[PDB]
Amino acid sequence: GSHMGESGKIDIDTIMTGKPKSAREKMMKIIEIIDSLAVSSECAKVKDILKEAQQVGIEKSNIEKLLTDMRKSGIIYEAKPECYKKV
């Protein structure tokens, strides 16, 4: 913005150095939807992520294995059935 800060102990560089941009292009998109849905919820319903991510063109098989990778990696968590929140 009018200033910046660190991404944290993880960045974009560490991804794009060993993955195509499609990694960030999806990763960021998923967490954007999760965080946008979570912005006044305990969690984002993956039903809603399934809606909006199929609208950005992500496949439901993608969304569900992506969400799975994310919760299992610690990029997000569940804490409710079918409802996930950006870490």
Q: What is the DSSP code string of 20-82?
A: -THHHHHHHHHHHHHHHHHTTSSSEEHHHHHHHHHHHT--HHHHHHHHHHHHHHTSEEEEETT
Task: Judge contact between 76 and 27, C-beta under 8 A.
Answer: no
Give 83's DSSP letter: E
Asked if CATH classification 1.10.10.10 holds for the domain at 1-87, the reply, yes or no, is yes
Rounded distance between C-alpha atoms, residue 4 and residue 12, angstroms: 15
CA distances from 14 to 7, 57, 75 (A): 11, 25, 15
- Asked if 41 and 77 touch (Cβ cutoff 8 Å), the reply is no
